[PDB]
Amino acid sequence: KSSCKRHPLYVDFNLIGWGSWIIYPKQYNAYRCEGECPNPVGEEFHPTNHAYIQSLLKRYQPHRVPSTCCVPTELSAISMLYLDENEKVVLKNYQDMVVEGCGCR
Amino acid sequence: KSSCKRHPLYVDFNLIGWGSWIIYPKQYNAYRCEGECPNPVGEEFHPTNHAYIQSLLKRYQPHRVPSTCCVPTELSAISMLYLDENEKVVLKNYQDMVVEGCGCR
């Protein structure tokens, strides 16, 4: 907004040197979280109790308390087809690969 | 280290204007997470798959990818004794009040 929210993140496995073993997908949208977490953190950013308290304390003490941080709070899996160290073909569901929700923590 | 890790955070409820309703505890150590998350993120920072991939991508693309962020990854509850809006005394376990573990996310 520039407040904490989800944004695209296009990951190309060729770029990070993994294209020799990952067969599919070579590229995928992993998304990302980015944006400021205001003090105090409103309910729309789904803070934990701890995050809310830290953000309120930062209002009253801006120089000794760090802001809470915009991070993934819900993630989902993708299936990847790849070659293992023995060149066996493996199909596996990898957890926590795609950001589905962001929040201040 | 200054790498991502847990640090103290002394919360005084009197300071944030909640001392009129919270009876106990008036102050508690909530802790906090703070410190850099290196690229790529090592196993010691307990990254998710997504956090690891984002951090590796940032190595190869430092200007378009944000660093992963040091946040609470495990939290615990505290019991609070307080007065509600009707001045009834309530004893309740509040979740997510104390940081117990930090990681890059």
Q: Compute CA distances B41 → B49, B52, B56, whole Å.
A: 10, 6, 8
Residue B24: φ, ψ to 5° = -155, 135
- The approach used to solve this structure was X-ray
What is the rounded distance in angstroms from the CA atom of residue B10 to the CA atom of residue B52?
31
Q: Is B83 helix (H, G, I), strand (E, B) or coil?
A: strand
Helix or strand (DSSP H, E) at A105: none
Nearest to A34 among B50, B56, B66 (CB): B66
CATH code, A1-105: 2.10.90.10
- CB A16 to CB B65 under 8 A? no
Chain A to chain B Cβ contacts (< 8 Å): 85
DSSP letter (8 states) at residue B43: G
> Do B18 and B80 contact (CB within 8 A), yes or no?
no
CA dihedral B26, B27, B28, B30 (to 10 degrees): 110
B interface residues, A as partner, C-beta within 8 Å:
9, 11, 15-16, 30, 32, 34, 48-51, 53-54, 56-57, 59-61, 65-66, 68-72, 75, 94-99, 105
What is the rounded distance in angstroms from the CA atom of residue A13 to the CA atom of residue A30?
11
Of B75, B72, B74, B65, which is closest to residue B34 (Cα–Cα)? B72
Instruction: Note the Cα B63 to chain centre separation in Å.
Output: 27
Place of tokens 């103290």: B8
> Do B37 and B67 contact (CB within 8 A), yes or no?
yes
For B73, nearest residue in chain A (alpha carbons) = A105
Nearest to B15 among A60, A72, A105 (CB): A60
CA distance between the termini of chain A: 18
Tell how many helices (H) and how many strands (E) occur in chain A: 1, 7
What is the rounded distance in angstroms from the CA atom of residue B62 to the CA atom of residue B59?
6
Helix or strand (DSSP H, E) at B99: strand B89-104
Of B92, B75, B93, B97, which is closest to residue B29 (Cα–Cα)? B97
For chain B, the structural domain boundaries read 1-105
Residue B23 — left, alpha, or beta (φ > 0 → left; ψ -120 to 50 → alpha)?
alpha
Of B22, B69, B101, B15, which is closest to residue A64 (Cα–Cα)? B15
How many C-beta atoms lie closer than 10 Å to residue A81's C-beta?
12
- CB A49 to CB B95 under 8 A? yes
Residues of B in contact with A66 (CB under 8 A): 32, 34
